[PDB]
């Protein structure tokens, strides 16, 4: 975010929540391995 902007801290907390409730991890698993072209 641009320095001193209003969005920085709330999007920060949003990122916190998303990491805690497993959204980031699930999304990660979705885009990397699950959409994967070969095996496991």
């Amino acid at each position: 975010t641009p320095k001193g902007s209003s969005l920085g801290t709330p999007v920060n907390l949003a990122v916190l929540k998303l990491s805690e409730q497993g959204v980031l991890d699930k999304l990660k698993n979705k885009w990397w391995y699950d959409k994967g072209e070969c095996g496991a």
């Binding site: 001193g4 902007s5 209003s6 801290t9």
Partner: protein, 125 residues
């Protein structure tokens, strides 16, 4: 009303005086009707009122620019109900515009950043 009419009877061409939140409309309306000019150091009127010359500049834009300058998101605002609500109305409307969180307290009867709109006397208290 008494003093102004007294000056009108003496046939003054113009009058230099002060006003307060209570008496300002008297001066504006009477100067407007009698077409006699009023010159004042006091706070600018909230409107276009004629025959009034304000020696004082309006402070609102400067203030907003300053609050925007320090990049204040949420802050606290202390207004003196005796002086006027003009600048308060300003900062609140412009807060609604600019996505500010403003805490407005009437001191005339939590954030670290405090804006004092007051006469110099109250600030010390």
């Amino acid at each position: 009303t008494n003093a102004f009419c007294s000056q009108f009877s003496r046939g003054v061409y113009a009058i230099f005086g002060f006003y307060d939140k209570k008496s300002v409309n008297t001066i504006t309306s009477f100067c407007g009707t009698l077409h006699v000019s009023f010159i004042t150091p006091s706070f600018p009127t909230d409107g276009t009122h004629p025959f009034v010359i304000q020696m004082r500049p309006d402070l609102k834009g400067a203030l907003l620019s300053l609050i925007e300058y320090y990049q204040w998101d949420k802050f606290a605002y202390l207004y003196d109900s005796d002086r006027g609500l003009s600048t308060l109305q300003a900062v609140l409307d412009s807060a609604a515009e600019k996505k500010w969180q403003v805490t407005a307290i009437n001191v005339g009867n939590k954030e670290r950043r405090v804006i004092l709109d007051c006469e110099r006397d109250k600030v010390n208290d």
